[PDB]
Amino acid sequence: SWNSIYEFTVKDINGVDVSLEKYRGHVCLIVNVACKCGATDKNYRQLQEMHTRLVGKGLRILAFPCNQFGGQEPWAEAEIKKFVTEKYGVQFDMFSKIKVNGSDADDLYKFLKSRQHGTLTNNIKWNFSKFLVDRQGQPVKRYSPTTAPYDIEGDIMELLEKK
Ligand SMILES: [Li+]
């Protein structure tokens, strides 16, 4: 019966559980991440630039580490946090590691995938897929891993302009 992302609670990268009610009224870009992928640098760099450009306008970027793709997120949370903060200066919201596929996927990802279908098949295909969520907590677009974060900015602006 879940009707929006606000129904879910997740553990942040510091081990602090937070309800996604926190994000009511903001546009969210939800990204599954990994530190040991060939596109790690470009995704984190562009996400941090987009955070800096758009956080004041209502964008919230949420990054969920996940080790389901090629064993590319093997580290624990403290090490992930240190890596991304020291290398990229990440200021957006980082979470504890989850699964995005299978029956043990976080309910947030079960929900996201139930709202926006992937290309051909529905499982998350690799690290750095993106879901765009409007100011009412509705997932309204999904982008494949190879989509540069910058190419999502136009769609973000449309949703930021809405009430
Ligand atoms: Li499928």
For ion ligand 1, residues whose CB falls within 5 Å: 121-122
Q: What residues does each domain of the chain span? A: 1-163
11's tokens: 């553990």
Q: How far is the CA of 59 from the centre of ligand 1 (A)?
A: 30
Q: How far, in Å, from the CA of 105 to the mean position of ligand 1?
A: 15
Is domain 1-163 given the CATH code 3.40.30.10 in the classification? yes
Active site residue 35: no
Sign (positive or negative) of CA dihedral 132, 138, 140, 144: positive
Give me the count of residues in the chain.
163
Experimental technique used to determine this entry? X-ray
Task: Give CA–CA dist 156/111, Å, rounded.
Answer: 20
Resolution value (Å, 1 decimal): 1.0
For every residue of the chain, which 3-state class applies, written as one string? CCCCHHHCEEEECCCCEEEHHHHCCCEEEEEEECCCCCCHHHHHHHHHHHHHHHHHHCEEEEEEECCCCCCCCCCCHHHHHHHHHHHHCCCCEEECCCCCCCCCCCHHHHHHHHHCCCCCCCCCCCCCCEEEECCCCCEEEEECCCCCHHHHHHHHHHHHHCC
Q: How many CB atoms lie within 10 A of CB 109?
A: 23
Instruction: Identify the burial level of 49 via C-beta atoms within 10 angstroms of its C-beta, where 0-12 means exposed, 13-18 middle and 19 or more buried.
Output: middle
Q: How many angstroms separate the CA atoms of 29 and 47, rounded?
A: 9
User: Measured in angstroms, how far is the CA atom of residue 139 from the centroid of ligand 1?
Assistant: 19
CA distances from 162 to 8, 26, 27, 62, 134 (A): 23, 10, 10, 20, 9
Written as one letter, the residue type at 135 is: R
**How far is residue 22's CA from residue 20's CA, in Å, rounded to a whole number?**
5
CA 152, 153, 154, 158 torsion: positive or negative? positive
